[PDB]
Write a protein that binds this ligand. Structure first.
Ligand code: UA4
Ligand code: UA4
Lengths: 336, 336
């Protein structure tokens, strides 16, 4: 009978991270809570300073923790936008009043691109042990083993960005869901398969037409991804209907065209989940001379997880998301 | 025991709108939530494409909704600026986690001036049944009937526009208010009568002297109007005292001089509600080589409602507003 809310910071609507403590005394780290991966890692004090990303981030020093336990097994974590490498270490980790003995990665190789653009230091995988590298027990499995949570679930609220600092960037509840940050009722979709936060998606419509995901596709619900992503061929067609021009990494429209772009809907479990243009364009201007980025990207995720769409922070911002380990399902409700 | 919020989009500080769903399944429309009118309406699928506005808006297709019930009674809705016509239909409307069977207008006539400029598709009238054309029961009355709301009130937050954020454009709350977007406590002013969201104003001060509305006048609190307005005469005097001159269509001031302009105070229920020049000058720049318009316009509203001042989006931006149907009054508090 315990819940645990961790307050998240929202950087520019693209990064959402909260604080954890590792060691004794606690060394604090900004970390993304990430259902698209299953390992915990933070930068290490053994990371050569020729990696400038390690110069600009908090580094874990095992020599300052009395509760540290050595392992030393090498590990590499491959994310869709970048890679980190290092070795395994055990210590106590605090996540919102819960304390857990956890195996995590001390990262000694941390590419400047993209990690010099990271406001966060590391990542907390909220995914399953089946996708864990080195078969390291994920942190939420260790918390479940304590038997202190009311429900074996966790939930994500990602707020819109704000100019002031009185609005919360977001929130992860461990052991439940916060009714202050959603309205209406949860609508649940079973996982295709345990081991991945991935569900069946029946269709994707853009405007007055269902031009995408005909006959079906996959949808990984990914709190560690900034954007909604689809396959390269799915997105070239999505962005033809929008009128966006393919820039280097992102897509863009003329800023004045932003508000008139069509609704994009996502058919999940007998319910339509609809984003307006306000939800997926970074409306920085109304000028026909400036360019505005869309919060939708192309990403070709390889098997066995893909090929699939990924519903990242663009989607979760609109729909409060409950991840349910007990019944292997994902619930969505309108965020507030 | 229930509250229901809808996040709103701010377009250029002159349009504010959020999502509703009509039908089964729900079709998504952007609507202005409008205390200065009492009818719901969205564009119709039957709307001829000769009206260019219908080509560039979302259309309600009654054939694609299993909850739709027919009723072809005609109606014309006349606003200050534009005019639309159509016929009545019945269906379920989703307003932020609340569902309610509602009579609204499917619109088949939709002039380019001004509805081509409308970033919203339709309007949700939050006014009283007394000003409802066709005697149609307004949506808030139907929601009161299902008896789920905490209080018989609804509130409006309209945010300032910022080009360097993806900020909350605004927020309506049905059944209460959100203290995150105001400070202190509400002070209320009773309506003159039920049926119109219209209060007594005891004067409008420009700086020190109380130059206008000396012997009292009226004030519509209108969430569907973009500006504060007064009669052509009252605005003439106000603008002469501000040092503003009629450019061609609008009143302007040198952008650099904007900050020198005096406060404007609206005396409502024994308190002074004060906008600074930052609140009522659109400072697109501060250049001494450019002109800047004011968010206050002349508008001769005809009887029986007029002639009156109207406190539109300019005013609501400054003061979070709570519309209290139980007590027939309006509460203001400083927005944040
Ligand atoms: C968290 C680890 C993670 N987990 C899964 N499942 N997917 C991705 N893409 C990532 C990931 C990796 C690296 C990475 C990020 C995400 N994020 C997004 C954080 C999301 O917060 C919720 C970034 O912002 C950053 C700095 C990045 C910035 C950038 F401008 C372009 C990039 F390609 C990557 O670097
Ligand atoms: C909501 C319906 C409404 N309700 C009442 N009470 N008054 C007015 N004037 C209106 C109204 C009618 C039409 C109309 C608008 C408001 N608004 C303002 C939306 C306000 O959002 C908070 C418009 O922006 C628009 C497109 C318009 C653009 C323009 F450049 C000149 C116009 F005359 C009208 O067209």
């Amino acid at each position: 009978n315990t819940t645990s809310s961790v307050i998240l910071t929202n950087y520019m609507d693209t990064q959402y991270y909260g604080e954890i403590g590792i060691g004794t005394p606690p060394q604090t780290f900004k970390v993304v809570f990430d259902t698209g991966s299953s390992n915990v890692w933070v930068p290490s004090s053994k990371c050569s300073r020729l990696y400038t990303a390690c110069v600009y981030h908090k580094l874990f020093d095992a020599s300052d923790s009395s509760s540290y336990k050595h392992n030393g097994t090498e590990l590499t974590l491959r994310y869709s936008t970048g890679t980190v490498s290092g070795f395994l270490s055990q210590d106590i980790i605090t996540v919102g009043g819960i304390t857990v003995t956890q195996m995590f990665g001390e990262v000694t190789e941390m590419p400047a691109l993209p990690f010099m653009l990271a406001e966060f230091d590391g990542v907390v995988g909220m995914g399953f042990i089946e996708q864990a590298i080195g078969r390291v027990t994920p942190i939420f499995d260790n918390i479940i083993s304590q038997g202190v949570l009311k429900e074996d679930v966790f939930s994500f609220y990602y707020n819109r960005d704000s100019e002031n600092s009185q609005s919360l960037g977001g929130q992860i509840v461990l052991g439940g869901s916060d009714p202050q940050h959603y309205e209406g009722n949860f609508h649940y979709i079973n996982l295709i398969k345990t081991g991945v936060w991935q569900i069946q998606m029946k269709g994707v419509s853009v405007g007055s037409s269902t031009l995408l995901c005909e006959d079906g596709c996959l949808a990984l619900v990914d709190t560690g991804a900034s954007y909604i992503s689809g396959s390269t061929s799915s997105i070239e067609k999505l962005m033809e209907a929008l009128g966006a021009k393919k820039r280097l990494f992102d897509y863009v429209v003329k800023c004045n065209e932003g508000p008139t772009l069509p609704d994009i809907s996502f058919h999940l479990g007998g319910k339509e989940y609809t984003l307006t243009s306000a939800d997926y364009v970074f409306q920085e201007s109304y000028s026909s001379k400036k360019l505005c980025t869309l919060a939708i990207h192309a990403m070709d995720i390889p098997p066995p997880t893909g090929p699939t769409w990924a519903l990242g922070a663009t989607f979760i911002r609109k729909f409060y998301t409950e991840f349910d380990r007990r019944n292997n399902r994902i619930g969505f409700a309108l965020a507030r």
